[PDB]
Amino acid sequence: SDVFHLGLTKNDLQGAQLAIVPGDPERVEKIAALMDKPVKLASHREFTTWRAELDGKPVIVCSTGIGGPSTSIAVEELAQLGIRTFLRIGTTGAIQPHINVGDVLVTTASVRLDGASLHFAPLEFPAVADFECTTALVEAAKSIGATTHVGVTASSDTFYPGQERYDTYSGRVVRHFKGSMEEWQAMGVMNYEMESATLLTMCASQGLRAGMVAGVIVNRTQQEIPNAETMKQTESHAVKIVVEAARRLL
Amino acid sequence: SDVFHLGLTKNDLQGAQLAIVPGDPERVEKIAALMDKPVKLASHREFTTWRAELDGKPVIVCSTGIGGPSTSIAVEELAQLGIRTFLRIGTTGAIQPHINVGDVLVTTASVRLDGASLHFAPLEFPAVADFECTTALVEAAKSIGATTHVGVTASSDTFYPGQERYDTYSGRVVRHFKGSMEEWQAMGVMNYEMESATLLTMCASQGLRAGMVAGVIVNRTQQEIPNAETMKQTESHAVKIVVEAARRLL
Amino acid sequence: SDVFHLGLTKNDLQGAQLAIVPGDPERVEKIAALMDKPVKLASHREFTTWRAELDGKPVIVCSTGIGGPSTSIAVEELAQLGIRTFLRIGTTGAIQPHINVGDVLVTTASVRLDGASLHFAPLEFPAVADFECTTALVEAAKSIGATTHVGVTASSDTFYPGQERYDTYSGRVVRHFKGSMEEWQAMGVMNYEMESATLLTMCASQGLRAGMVAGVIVNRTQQEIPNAETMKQTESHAVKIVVEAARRLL
Amino acid sequence: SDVFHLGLTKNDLQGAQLAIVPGDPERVEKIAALMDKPVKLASHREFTTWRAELDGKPVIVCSTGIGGPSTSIAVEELAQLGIRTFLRIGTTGAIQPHINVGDVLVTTASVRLDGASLHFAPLEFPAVADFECTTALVEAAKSIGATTHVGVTASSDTFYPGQERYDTYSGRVVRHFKGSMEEWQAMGVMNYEMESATLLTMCASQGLRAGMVAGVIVNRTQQEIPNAETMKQTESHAVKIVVEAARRLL
Amino acid sequence: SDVFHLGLTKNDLQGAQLAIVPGDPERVEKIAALMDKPVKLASHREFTTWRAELDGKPVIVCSTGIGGPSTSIAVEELAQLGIRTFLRIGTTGAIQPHINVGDVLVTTASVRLDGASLHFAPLEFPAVADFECTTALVEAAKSIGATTHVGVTASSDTFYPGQERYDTYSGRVVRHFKGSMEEWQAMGVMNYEMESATLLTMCASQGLRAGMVAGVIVNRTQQEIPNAETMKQTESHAVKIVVEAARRLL
Amino acid sequence: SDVFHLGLTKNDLQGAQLAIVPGDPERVEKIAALMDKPVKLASHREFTTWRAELDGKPVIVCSTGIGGPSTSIAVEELAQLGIRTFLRIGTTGAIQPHINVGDVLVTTASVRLDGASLHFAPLEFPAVADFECTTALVEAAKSIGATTHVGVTASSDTFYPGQERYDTYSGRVVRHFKGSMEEWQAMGVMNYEMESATLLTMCASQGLRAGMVAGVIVNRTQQEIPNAETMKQTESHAVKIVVEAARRLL
Ligand SMILES: [K+]
Ligand SMILES: [K+]
Ligand SMILES: [K+]
């Protein structure tokens, strides 16, 4: 390997300068299979990587794992192997009443509820997306007729207390986080997830382009349990959007 | 009057929902004059307000004064008077080598080197521009052929120490600010100015739309005294840009 | 001009080493007109300057605008032009029940609810007034029989949320500021305003003398609407006090 | 499954109350295999879970992925599934001259260079190991004659800047982290790793028991490329230690 | 004197490398008198020092006064005179319902509610005890049949507001501290006292060994007034434990 | 006794409402002796209390020990016992070139380098002296012809690292404190001491009056070993000053 974690060589990438970066390794084969000539490159720890081709151009798909720490590894190592553009795709829970299940969120910038962003820029630095990547994502979403919200996302180093989930072992939330979600709701924040503050801050502060889309699968203000077809249909739609954005940035 | 500071009543605005917000009271008339039916409404403190008409629609132009405090009063009072979108326009000094004088900077989000933004949202929240506004400003730049850079601006509560100026009374900078400029330039920041971290935080956190454009009059990494002619011309080009963006946002 | 903002030359000051610094430009002519041979020097942005003479000595009156940012400009530039002593005068809202409308507040030091003070000294540094200027102000107030409180003032980068005003567009206050006024009341804080934390910290940390007086025009614990005569009578009384303090510091 | 991420049900665990928690999914089977009746339970995301049996008692081995976020999800979900004690085992780089490769480090508490710990307790709370766990790990080290150092570990949300690595894409470290390594070495810290400040804070703050052991594979103060053979052997020695401690904690 | 405060020479210590450090000077003679050949060395300010012998080895007893500031003096000066191991003993109030009057607390690490610890290590550094000293203390306690809790202690720079005592002059607690005790209770914290965050952080970050035991004299969750015999009997028992730990560390 | 620490009852004080508060128990009698009817009341821990009589009025003199923690206990307990004004007196080291040994320093406010002040008010609140007290101390200095400097003092929770002393066990200073002394001297600070940020914050935030005077025994910028005679004489001059101020504040 040319890098410490990913198990990849420069030649494995065949010149790729753009990576789609889901958190879940299981989505890597899915996205790559939407593209031409998908081939599996490597799988180690949370990092599963495939290569494919889009409009005759090599593209990478690599999973980040959950959270800023493993994200910052994947971005750092892909950057050493020539990746310059990074497009995160996921599914998410909305926290505003006007967003519906099936809608699409494009993130302009994130609230930094994480640790890793601080290892690249102090807190006053904005966790902002690349304007070209944001534009390509909104254009792609509107091109397939998605209902699309564009705005702020809160990025948390935990799934449970930092998103004020109380159905947990302890059933309590530390003082600093208790009531925080209602603050973020009043401030127009669309959703929570767990990798964009790191992704956006580290890319923006190092001349790398990054952006983020997500399919809404639950609305925590009007919460319904999703069935599989809905999770699949929402996942597919965000995957289609992200590939189409990638076409526009190649 | 209907507000504590600006000396304006609601009917003065005639239904206006967009305001162009320079810092300098002097620039107010310069902007009004591009549009139809310019009328001075009020001059109180740092706040000089004219109204004008663009494609048959009332637009406001209202100066903020320098700094987040006076910006916050102007935004809040204009919001009480029906303004939902706010476009800042300045002239500025670049801090990157590749930016040139007479280039145009559209800001996607700002480093929060201010105090007033904290009065709307904790430090982790990003001082992010509205996507529609930022798009309209990039497309408006392209519509007069400007050379445009899209990226992060550092927003400082001081002109002197916070922007690491040493030709001062004391000729010193406090430890926290000594050497900050090099860190911001490493992280790709384009320029400093003194109102945008306030303006973008308070608007993104309350569902008002905001955006910012500036014209470059000096490049601190290759610093020349600016020509009287260049400054006027770059000012006028930035002025046109922000009016044309207004036009696309009505 | 010899300075970037104020539009002043060294010779304009005729040797003045003391400036009275109200926030409102409209008060500049008023104060200068209490003195001998008042002449208008310049007016640009929030900075209106007049020169006069007191006991045959030149004095400056210059407005700061609202907030620490424009304040720090005015102080910095007047310091480059030879001002060493700075006496802020305003009118204010009391936040304690024992203070009455018409009373006078002299500030010993301020709670730093601002951004600009931090560009001169870290937060643990006290925003303290000059002992000679505080003494001259208390002596002057007692000399005309004022009822005078001497103590702490909270200095905020906003007029609205940082002074927990709720009659606003959003009608809400960010978590950090919600309930803060009742903390400041329990701690004996007399009032809020918006320039002294910057003024005091930047002067105290640079060998410059500064102090602050204010006339009480509303008591927010027993709030009455003032009529014009009361605002005039209160303003006049604080103006008389500040000039008389200036006599004692010349 | 009974939890959002791990894909496990309660009955899967068969009454297990202790979990051994490596970062790397690959190490899971290596640990399981020391014990009786190894059975792979699940592989999802970074979380690979086996069960095994030690002295007739069900034990879990479940990988956390890299970093506090994925560690927090694994700990919370395993706690919902009856796990009350959690032992981490890694391999690591020393940062003290007197530590040698193949030595063993038992951590008493960790420097909190992470974000997820903050989601359980404010920064002042110590990221401290459970005394029973730490004792069992020291005595377990002594029971195979290991050379053991007992002390503080620095726990970083990044592998690269937070551990002051400069052989990177950018080759720079942000100001706050530049020169931190020398300060930690002055203060006697032994090593860096990427999960323990999360793991120990969240467990000490909720009455779960946690502890950590690692084997030293590199000494950054006298840095040698590690031998394939040494690494396997030190890994196996750390693995044995954490199983033997488990044995004393059942 | 060889030191600025303690009034001690190197020869006064006769080679002692271990000090027992109570806060109260009155306890110095008490502890020393449990040992052989106790002699009074000096008394200045809060620093009372006696020397004795244990298993034919010289030992020091020196009082710290209350709080991290005077503690950091006593530790610093005893360190210059050859002390390497420091064993704090006190009596305390429990804040958990399961701890009884007469029980013994051994502190693994402390919540840093103090100022002085920060003059030795930033807040993310754990205020952790020496493993050998913690072990010797637990072994000693169990050796005389004590009921012993081992875990976290909150160390506060005040007796009153930082331990949320309300029977005071003002009867109020600053916002930051109001409700903090119920946070510390939920997090398993055993008790409050006022010197260990400083003691532990400063020793751990400088290669010095430290530990802490306390006898429970009141339980603030089920609060009873103690009589003298109980305070004596509890004090004696902690003194016996600390001397016996000192025997094991000599 | 009526309080937890000081061993005093209310009637002991005979109606006293002012306390003079040295750090050192030894100085207590030295101060008492200037006044009429000196009587030792109590000695417990660092707290030595005498009463005396000045112009027929009971005054208390009570030592605080070193540091904000023990100062906070003394102030709170004396406040429970009717003390409403508190004057500190020390000897100190200057950190400015123009100050001379045997000069007198009256403190207007303090840099908050302590932890206990935070237990009364957040960091932004100023550690400011009471105006009546400070005036009485300046006029009292003038009444014996002392050379007086009026200004800011840095108040440190440590004697060694926080005051940037390097002739220590470790001979090092943590990063945050390394080079702080030069910043304080730039900002005009006069001296360091170890109780005033506590004393002034807790009193200004609860409506008690406080003030501080000190005599200069060493000038760290031109450092000489102090003469036994000079120190006694400067101590006595500071002692007289604080008694004479007491006299003007009764
Ligand atoms: K991970
Ligand atoms: K202004
Ligand atoms: K003390």
Side-chain angles (χ1 to χ4, degrees), chain A residues 3-5 23-27 44-47 64-70 72-73 76-77 79-80 83-84 113-116 118-122 156-163 165 167-170 172-174 176-177 194 205-208, chain D residues 3-5 23-27 44-47 64-70 72-73 76-77 79-80 83-84 113-116 118-122 156-163 165 167-170 172-174 176-177 194 205-208:
Chain A
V3 298
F4 280 109
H5 300 80
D24 189 341
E26 189 183 336
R27 283 181 167 155
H44 293 276
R45 300 174 169 275
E46 56 260 61
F47 318 104
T64 57
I66 293 180
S70 63
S72 68
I73 295 168
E76 170 66 18
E77 300 189 357
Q80 298 188 34
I83 303 293
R84 295 186 179 155
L113 307 174
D114 76 316
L118 289 170
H119 297 214
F120 296 93
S156 160
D157 264 358
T158 58
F159 180 88
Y160 289 101
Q163 301 181 44
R165 299 198 154 87
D167 187 40
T168 53
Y169 179 82
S170 72
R172 65 174 229 251
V173 166
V174 70
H176 186 250
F177 276 101
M194 302 184 54
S205 69
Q206 286 190 286
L208 296 172
Chain D
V3 293
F4 281 116
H5 303 84
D24 194 332
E26 190 139 87
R27 298 227 278 230
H44 287 298
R45 295 175 172 282
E46 49 269 64
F47 313 107
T64 65
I66 289 167
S70 61
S72 71
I73 283 171
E76 168 59 29
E77 300 180 14
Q80 291 174 174
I83 310 287
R84 293 152 185 186
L113 306 182
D114 68 330
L118 293 171
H119 298 206
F120 301 86
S156 174
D157 266 358
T158 56
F159 180 88
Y160 290 98
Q163 304 187 24
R165 295 190 148 78
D167 191 36
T168 62
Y169 177 76
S170 80
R172 45 168 256 272
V173 176
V174 66
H176 185 72
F177 282 97
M194 299 183 63
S205 65
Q206 283 179 273
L208 301 166

Side-chain angles (χ1 to χ4, degrees), chain F residues 1-190:
Chain F
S1 143
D2 280 327
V3 293
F4 281 116
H5 303 84
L6 299 190
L8 290 177
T9 70
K10 187 69 174 299
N11 325 300
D12 272 335
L13 268 60
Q14 311 195 142
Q17 293 188 317
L18 184 150
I20 294 164
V21 286
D24 194 332
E26 190 139 87
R27 298 227 278 230
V28 185
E29 184 180 356
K30 306 196 156 178
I31 301 154
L34 280 227
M35 299 177 265
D36 295 328
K37 284 213 190 131
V39 43
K40 178 178 253 215
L41 284 182
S43 184
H44 287 298
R45 295 175 172 282
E46 49 269 64
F47 313 107
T48 288
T49 299
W50 285 58
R51 199 182 54 214
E53 197 177 84
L54 165 69
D55 295 335
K57 292 193 149 177
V59 164
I60 288 312
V61 184
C62 174
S63 66
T64 65
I66 289 167
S70 61
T71 294
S72 71
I73 283 171
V75 177
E76 168 59 29
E77 300 180 14
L78 286 167
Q80 291 174 174
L81 295 178
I83 310 287
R84 293 152 185 186
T85 298
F86 293 80
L87 300 175
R88 182 157 144 67
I89 178 271
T91 47
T92 194
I95 69 175
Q96 300 286 344
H98 65 292
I99 305 168
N100 298 322
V101 163
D103 292 350
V104 160
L105 313 181
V106 174
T107 294
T108 53
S110 289
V111 196
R112 294 180 53 178
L113 306 182
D114 68 330
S117 70
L118 293 171
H119 298 206
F120 301 86
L123 191 53
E124 308 92 278
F125 182 106
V128 68
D130 174 272
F131 172 91
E132 290 176 314
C133 299
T134 299
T135 295
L137 291 159
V138 172
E139 287 181 345
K142 283 214 162 63
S143 92
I144 60 161
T147 297
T148 310
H149 300 269
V150 182
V152 169
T153 293
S155 197
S156 174
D157 266 358
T158 56
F159 180 88
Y160 290 98
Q163 304 187 24
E164 285 204 76
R165 295 190 148 78
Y166 289 87
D167 191 36
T168 62
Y169 177 76
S170 80
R172 45 168 256 272
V173 176
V174 66
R175 189 184 176 164
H176 185 72
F177 282 97
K178 181 181 249 299
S180 63
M181 188 172 157
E182 285 184 11
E183 290 284 296
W184 317 130
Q185 299 173 298
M187 289 176 195
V189 180
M190 306 188 287

Side-chain angles (χ1 to χ4, degrees), chain F residues 184-228:
Chain F
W184 317 130
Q185 299 173 298
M187 289 176 195
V189 180
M190 306 188 287
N191 64 307
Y192 281 115
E193 58 68 71
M194 299 183 63
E195 294 73 42
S196 74
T198 300
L199 174 65
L200 302 173
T201 311
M202 72 185 300
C203 290
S205 65
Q206 283 179 273
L208 301 166
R209 309 190 304 171
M212 181 165 66
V213 68
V216 171
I217 61 162
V218 53
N219 184 321
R220 292 196 51 200
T221 79
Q222 300 160 9
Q223 190 171 259
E224 295 176 25
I225 298 124
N227 223 122

Side-chain angles (χ1 to χ4, degrees), chain E residues 143-193:
Chain E
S143 94
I144 67 155
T147 294
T148 305
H149 312 273
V150 177
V152 177
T153 292
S155 187
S156 160
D157 264 358
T158 58
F159 180 88
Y160 289 101
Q163 301 181 44
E164 254 200 288
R165 299 198 154 87
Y166 287 89
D167 187 40
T168 53
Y169 179 82
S170 72
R172 65 174 229 251
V173 166
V174 70
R175 178 190 180 138
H176 186 250
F177 276 101
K178 189 171 193 164
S180 55
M181 170 168 175
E182 284 183 359
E183 292 290 290
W184 316 130
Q185 292 173 311
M187 303 179 188
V189 172
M190 307 178 299
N191 70 306
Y192 291 98
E193 53 73 70

Side-chain angles (χ1 to χ4, degrees), chain A residues 118-131:
Chain A
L118 289 170
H119 297 214
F120 296 93
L123 190 53
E124 57 264 27
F125 188 106
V128 71
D130 178 76
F131 180 74

